[PDB]
């Protein structure tokens, strides 16, 4: 209840099993029990309670919306509790959180224990790992110009983009990726600079996609 | 399942002004021992939700007295007396009188700043992209407020619908603006079968729409 740490595979195929572990680092001693839950959040959507269990028992409560595809268990000796999900649909891509809740009567006033893990993004997709194609975005604007890089048709998330080996940060906007109908992702990163600097300064975008072990640097000039 | 309805979906607030978020349940949240089982969470940007108010009206330690919760058995209100920048994020109500636990749909609180018109840029595809078989033409709207904006694509002067997708940044921590990308994707033969490409932007900061265009080649 001092800390919750989630772990598990970041990408799972639709026929496979989604398996997540939550490791509980406890706090000051007390008598009674905690309730541990799994909650998920699809990208840009709300929260959905998956299921949970009290620490003193071996019976699990489940959300009926989850069609009995979820199996949640715990081990206080392994200070862990687990989520298994199968079969899967693209609709199960989400950030998954583990939570611990209790009413706290140990103090002079009634209070709450309420702890959340950082969450783990799990993408369900049959797409194969693929490195991105990186194309420069060159200025087509008289006072200030804009440059960018298009990083397209990669899988899975995430990709990281820096400018001039991280030396350029002011005015940088890296847009959230969009899932294409092909099952791959594409995004753009842009930066605005004074046009007078276009002749004197070099601008390079550095793209890193570790799932495919791809690293690209593209110069963007006019 | 108990249905939780939360209003509104999005709440822009000028700093210092009050905000009110409503939540309803389809059933009473009053349990046997007389407690009303309704909690409020706040999920700050890039973070996990955490508990803000519990049992309708009790503030978690560290939550300022600016936050207050009220309600009946089925109708609940979270009030923020004067909104500050640290308050931005998504608020969620949650009932726990019965399984399954259910959440409201969330209310995104953002900072209202002065109107700022977007800077508009268009990017013609590189020669590499043209040899790739598929082409992406990029339209950038830089540093604007509010979020609402219209982006229309024009091919040889004609309105083109379909084959385009948008992506928006979250509100910038430094100037409180948004930026937006609109990408038109075409087959290469289709791309080379036209001459002029343009994006037109409508936004409250512009007295009339702004058009950025290029001639292929």
């Amino acid at each position: 209840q001092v800390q919750l740490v989630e772990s598990g595979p970041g990408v799972v195929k639709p026929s496979e099993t989604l398996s997540l572990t939550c490791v509980v680092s406890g706090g000051t001693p007390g008598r009674g029990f905690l309730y541990w839950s799994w909650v998920r959040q699809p990208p840009g959507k709300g929260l959905e309670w998956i299921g949970g269990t009290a620490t003193n028992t071996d019976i699990t409560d489940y959300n009926p919306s989850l069609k009995s595809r979820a199996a949640i268990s715990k081990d206080t000796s392994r200070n862990q509790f687990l989520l298994n999900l199968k079969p899967l649909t693209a609709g199960d891509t989400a950030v998954y959180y583990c939570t611990s809740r209790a009413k706290d009567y140990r103090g002079p006033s009634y209070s709450r224990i309420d702890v959340w893990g950082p969450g783990v993004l799990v993408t369900v997709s049959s797409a194969s790992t693929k490195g991105p194609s990186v194309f420069p975005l060159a200025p087509s604007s008289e006072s200030t110009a804009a440059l960018g890089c298009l990083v397209k048709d990669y899988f899975p998330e995430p990709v990281t983009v820096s400018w001039n080996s991280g030396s350029l940060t002011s005015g940088v906007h890296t847009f959230p990726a969009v899932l294409q109908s092909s099952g791959l992702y594409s995004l753009s990163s842009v930066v605005t600079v004074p046009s007078s600097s276009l002749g004197t300064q070099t601008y390079v975008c550095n793209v890193n996609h570790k799932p495919s072990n791809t690293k690209v640097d593209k110069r963007v000039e006019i | 399942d108990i249905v939780m309805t939360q209003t509104p979906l999005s709440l822009p607030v000028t700093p210092g002004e009050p905000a009110s978020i409503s939540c309803r349940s389809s059933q009473s949240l009053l349990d046997s021992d007389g407690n009303t089982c309704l909690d409020w969470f706040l999920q700050k940007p890039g973070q996990s939700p955490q508990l803000l108010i519990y049992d309708v009206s009790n503030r978690v330690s560290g939550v300022p007295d600016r936050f207050s919760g009220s309600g009946s058995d089925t109708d609940f209100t979270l009030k923020i007396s004067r909104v500050e920048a640290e308050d931005v994020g998504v608020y969620y109500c949650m009932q726990f009188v019965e399984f399954p636990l259910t959440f409201g749909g969330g209310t995104k609180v953002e900072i209202r700043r002065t109107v700022a018109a977007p800077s508009v840029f268009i990017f013609p595809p590189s020669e590499d992209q043209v040899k790739s078989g598929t082409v992406s033409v990029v339209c950038l709207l830089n540093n604007f407020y509010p979020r609402e904006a219209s982006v229309k694509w024009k091919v040889d002067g004609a309105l083109k619908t379909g084959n385009s997708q948008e992506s928006v940044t979250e509100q910038d921590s430094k100037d409180n603006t948004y930026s937006l990308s609109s990408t038109l994707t075409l087959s290469s033969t289709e791309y080379q079968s036209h001459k002029v490409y343009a994006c037109e932007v409508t936004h409250q900061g512009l007295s009339s729409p702004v058009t950025k265009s290029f001639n292929r080649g």
């Binding site: 007390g30 008598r31 009674g32 029990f33 905690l34 309730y35 839950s37 309670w49 949970g52 009290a54 620490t55 409560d61 611990s100 809740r101 209790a102 009413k103 706290d104 009567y105 140990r106 224990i113 | 349990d31 407690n35 089982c37 726990f96 009188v97 019965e98 399984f99 636990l101």
Partner: peptide
């Protein structure tokens, strides 16, 4: 209430 523990 459901889905919540109790510590004393």
């Amino acid at each position: 209430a459901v889905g919540i523990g109790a510590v004393f």
